[PDB]
Amino acid sequence: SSQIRQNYSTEVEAAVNRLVNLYLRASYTYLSLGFYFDRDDVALEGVCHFFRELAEEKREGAERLLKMQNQRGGRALFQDLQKPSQDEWGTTLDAMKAAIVLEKSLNQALLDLHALGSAQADPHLCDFLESHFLDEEVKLIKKMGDHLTNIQRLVGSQAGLGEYLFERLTLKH
Amino acid sequence: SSQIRQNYSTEVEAAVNRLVNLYLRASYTYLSLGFYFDRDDVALEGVCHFFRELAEEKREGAERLLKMQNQRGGRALFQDLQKPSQDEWGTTLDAMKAAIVLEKSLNQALLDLHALGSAQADPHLCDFLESHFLDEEVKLIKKMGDHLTNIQRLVGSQAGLGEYLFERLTLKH
Amino acid sequence: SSQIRQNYSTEVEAAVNRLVNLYLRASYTYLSLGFYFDRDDVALEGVCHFFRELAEEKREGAERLLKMQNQRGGRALFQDLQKPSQDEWGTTLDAMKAAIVLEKSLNQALLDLHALGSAQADPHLCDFLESHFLDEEVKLIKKMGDHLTNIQRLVGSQAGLGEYLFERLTLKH
Amino acid sequence: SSQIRQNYSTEVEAAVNRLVNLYLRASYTYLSLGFYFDRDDVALEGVCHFFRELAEEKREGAERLLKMQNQRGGRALFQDLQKPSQDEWGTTLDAMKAAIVLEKSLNQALLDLHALGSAQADPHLCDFLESHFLDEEVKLIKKMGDHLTNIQRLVGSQAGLGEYLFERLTLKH
Amino acid sequence: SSQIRQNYSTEVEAAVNRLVNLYLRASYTYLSLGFYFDRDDVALEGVCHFFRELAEEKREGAERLLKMQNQRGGRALFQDLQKPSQDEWGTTLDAMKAAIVLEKSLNQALLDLHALGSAQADPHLCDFLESHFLDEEVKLIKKMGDHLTNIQRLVGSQAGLGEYLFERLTLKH
Amino acid sequence: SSQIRQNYSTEVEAAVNRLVNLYLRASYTYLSLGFYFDRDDVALEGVCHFFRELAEEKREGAERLLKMQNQRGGRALFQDLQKPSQDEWGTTLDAMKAAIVLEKSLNQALLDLHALGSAQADPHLCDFLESHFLDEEVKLIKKMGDHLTNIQRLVGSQAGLGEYLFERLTLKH
Ligand SMILES: [Au+]
Ligand SMILES: [Au+]
Ligand SMILES: [Au+]
Ligand SMILES: [Au+]
Ligand SMILES: [Au+]
Ligand SMILES: [Au+]
Ligand SMILES: [Au+]
Ligand SMILES: [Au+]
Ligand SMILES: [Au+]
Ligand SMILES: [Au+]
Ligand SMILES: [Au+]
Ligand SMILES: [Au+]
Ligand SMILES: [Au+]
Ligand SMILES: [Au+]
Ligand SMILES: [Au+]
Ligand SMILES: [Au+]
Ligand SMILES: [Au+]
Ligand SMILES: [Au+]
Ligand SMILES: [Au+]
Ligand SMILES: [Au+]
Ligand SMILES: [Au+]
Ligand SMILES: [Au+]
Ligand SMILES: [Au+]
Ligand SMILES: [Au+]
Ligand SMILES: [Au+]
Ligand SMILES: [Au+]
Ligand SMILES: [Au+]
Ligand SMILES: [Au+]
Ligand SMILES: [Au+]
Ligand SMILES: [Au+]
Ligand SMILES: [Au+]
Ligand SMILES: [Au+]
Ligand SMILES: [Au+]
Ligand SMILES: [Au+]
Ligand SMILES: [Au+]
Ligand SMILES: [Au+]
Ligand SMILES: [Au+]
Ligand SMILES: [Au+]
Ligand SMILES: [Au+]
Ligand SMILES: [Au+]
Ligand SMILES: [Au+]
Ligand SMILES: [Au+]
């Protein structure tokens, strides 16, 4: 077994595979979120685009992790992908709340894997997470908090109007 | 009678002529809708443009149908065009409601003609409807549903403000 | 009722609505004329283009009139559009004869409306007709007379050949 | 036998091979028609070009059919190509009459194959015919009817002059 | 429930959701196939690219289906995604064998859904499958059969050399 | 009979018509050869392109001959086109063997016609063959011999690998 593998614990290999599952789960969640906002009875295009873009980003993170797994001589192993936690996601506010919960879980998974890499003395893993994941997550979580604050401000009284305005003037489409 | 006509039933020929009447009726309805929104006491320019654009699209569909009638060796026959169902169209919401009702009737007419073509074993007619009409109608009806949802969200409380905002931030002009 | 309306009689308002009906009728007549010449058993493409172009021009005149109706604070009211006077239009000669009869009726309607505007002391209406309609009609009627003369010259003896030649060498396609 | 073949009946496979023969026959007919009009004692260049262009179109249709046969896992089988029905094709009128008869036979073959695909529940075949053949045939047959009408109009009295004029002013070269 | 929904059976809606699951499953299978060929102990880059490209194509098909679901007024419902059938995919030959089996299953699912649309008289669904899926699948399955034949020819005697050569001279990277 | 014909024997006229049949036969043979190599169970794209290109070249030669027939005042006469000698063409080697046999027969037909032109003292015919056919055939036959030699060298031991390599590194696609 691997001719290239060096300083790459079975523990980190397994944890990388679990993280791939988590990122692909998050991608699937964002696919569901995106298409919910494209429903004719929800129709918030900018919200749809925001979530579909994140579906792509999460999928990219999984592919980054799989490439890394191979560069270290580990073996990608895929598991069932569980469906998203909801079939309908409520208002933009509800949806952003669910998204920041999801991001925080990914973030905690990254931190846990960092702490494993540190215990296993694996500086290439630590560097890899710092280079492509930790700051990325921090920036996204901040953006989502900014959004939540703006949504929140808009939707006390006149909830519908606030939702429309946030979609039109903050979100991209 | 026609040197080119082949596999083209008198039933489909008549039904094509009726569909032309329906599309020209819808065009006239959208002309009336467009100019209502240009009234100084209504003054929603983006709404006016949205309906005038559809008047053009419906007229184009009628001309497509007439060209097809001729390519198959059928004979265009024109009937009186009935005036639109209303002289005043109310709010943007009322107007979009009336437009989606109209589109659904055109859609049902297309489906009925498809079902006739299928019973008459006329695959060129079926192809023609699929190529230029069925998806076009589906996309338009979806857009209108999206609009209705957004209008609806805006006009619970503060009806005037919501109407202005929808016109300014969703509709084109 | 209208905050903008000034010096705009109910008589001119009604007459503008009737003129809109006439122009849309003429547009429909030219649509029928155009597609007749596209029949495989008539097949005079340049004739078809000449009439379809006029269908567009007449529709534009109606839209000009409706825009004016709104700029003056009048209220567009639409009536049933009667179908064209014939289902088949004969030869190019027959068709041009029918077209110049139609244009003369539009012209007389314009003159009558001018005479109303003059009796109502409505110089904006008079200016509007002079700017966009009266000369336009005069030029078109002259063109049609030129055509009739050329068609007429061609179709004494050898009627078919003359018809083909006029279509090929005078009409555009 | 084929690793790719799926939902592709032996009946449709055979019928596709027969259609290839028909299209290559039609191509050969148009080659003969083209070169007849290039004879120094016929010399109607535009007619020659019109038929040679159709020879190419028919050959292209056969190649489209053969490519499809292969994409479905069927087996192209070629038969003898029968020579065209005439060695001399008469006037432009005679020739256009013969061409529209030929096109109608191809059209009927396409319809028959459509009806077979429908009975065999082969929606890829149906789509393939709709995409590349049915409308193409309808447009060509209409063009030919237009031509026949114009030729017919020209060649009552002064047959030679009419023939020259049609070739010069309608046909391309 | 939906203001836009018209002629859209609950049966087709459910079947569209199942097809989305199948396409996302196939995408996941191709992700696993792609990264297997990127393993340092397999190292066939062109094979990896071929499968990763198909992972993207299958994901795109699912998104096309979800967009359609929304345009018709149906409701996207997501299920668990089962992991791919194998963790290791053997040789290029083994892998292409598995891929054509997968494609044929997608193809059969498309055909079944076509047959449902036909039984439900849903011509927009039928058109949608013809426009974006049926020919696409046919072309891909043909390409894969071509590949299988070439792989097969190369890997009787000198299996390693044949595998390298196919990757270098047929597959893209 | 012909006003232009000069120094053009009935013998050469007939022989030109036979040569046209031969060239169109060869074109049909190459069409069959081309599509055989496009079969999913043969799949040698470069071989397919090589033969389809020759189908076009042979057809061009027939059209050159027909144009010449007309320029001399002869009369093109078309006969039945016999189907190709095989339905399946074996390996690339088998196919190239069959192609060089065919070319040699065309070449011998050209030589025979040259010898007829010489006996009939027809220097325009001789020039015509020298200008457009004799060298063309010589170059093609040489190319095919080169190919046969290279195929032959490759397919002693490891027949499949040799076939793939010849297609990839010598033939165009
Ligand atoms: Au979305
Ligand atoms: Au979106
Ligand atoms: Au998007
Ligand atoms: Au770390
Ligand atoms: Au570390
Ligand atoms: Au990165
Ligand atoms: Au954002
Ligand atoms: Au308007
Ligand atoms: Au407007
Ligand atoms: Au507009
Ligand atoms: Au249909
Ligand atoms: Au049909
Ligand atoms: Au269209
Ligand atoms: Au819109
Ligand atoms: Au026209
Ligand atoms: Au026209
Ligand atoms: Au036109
Ligand atoms: Au006046
Ligand atoms: Au006046
Ligand atoms: Au004007
Ligand atoms: Au003119
Ligand atoms: Au020709
Ligand atoms: Au020619
Ligand atoms: Au030509
Ligand atoms: Au069919
Ligand atoms: Au079918
Ligand atoms: Au095509
Ligand atoms: Au033409
Ligand atoms: Au890959
Ligand atoms: Au790759
Ligand atoms: Au790739
Ligand atoms: Au279907
Ligand atoms: Au259907
Ligand atoms: Au597509
Ligand atoms: Au490929
Ligand atoms: Au080929
Ligand atoms: Au090829
Ligand atoms: Au080719
Ligand atoms: Au000679
Ligand atoms: Au000679
Ligand atoms: Au030459
Ligand atoms: Au070559």
Coordinates of all heavy atoms in Angstrom, one line a residue, chain C residues 34 38 45 47-49 52, ligand 16:
Chain C
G34 N -51.4 40.2 -46.9 CA -50.0 39.6 -46.9 C -50.0 38.1 -47.0 O -49.4 37.5 -47.9
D38 N -48.8 34.9 -49.8 CA -47.9 33.8 -49.4 C -48.4 32.4 -49.7 O -47.8 31.4 -49.4 CB -47.5 34.0 -47.9 CG -46.7 32.9 -47.3 OD1 -45.5 32.8 -47.8 OD2 -47.1 32.3 -46.3
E45 N -44.1 36.8 -53.5 CA -43.4 37.1 -52.2 C -43.3 38.6 -52.0 O -43.5 39.1 -50.8 CB -42.0 36.5 -52.2 CG -41.5 36.7 -50.9 CD -40.1 36.2 -50.7 OE1 -39.7 35.3 -51.6 OE2 -39.4 36.6 -49.7
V47 N -45.2 40.9 -53.1 CA -46.5 41.4 -52.7 C -46.9 41.2 -51.3 O -47.4 42.1 -50.6 CB -47.7 40.8 -53.7 CG1 -49.0 41.5 -53.4 CG2 -47.3 41.0 -55.1
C48 N -46.6 39.9 -50.8 CA -46.8 39.6 -49.4 C -46.0 40.6 -48.5 O -46.5 41.1 -47.5 CB -46.3 38.1 -49.2 SG -46.2 37.5 -47.5
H49 N -44.7 40.8 -48.9 CA -43.9 41.7 -48.0 C -44.5 43.2 -48.0 O -44.5 43.8 -47.0 CB -42.3 41.7 -48.4 CG -41.7 40.4 -47.9 ND1 -41.5 40.1 -46.6 CD2 -41.1 39.4 -48.6 CE1 -40.9 38.9 -46.5 NE2 -40.7 38.5 -47.7
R52 N -47.5 43.1 -45.7 CA -47.1 42.9 -44.3 C -46.5 44.1 -43.6 O -46.8 44.5 -42.5 CB -46.3 41.6 -44.1 CG -47.2 40.4 -44.2 CD -46.4 39.1 -44.1 NE -46.0 38.9 -42.7 CZ -45.1 38.0 -42.4 NH1 -44.6 37.1 -43.3 NH2 -44.7 37.9 -41.1
Ligands
AU16 AU -44.0 38.2 -47.2

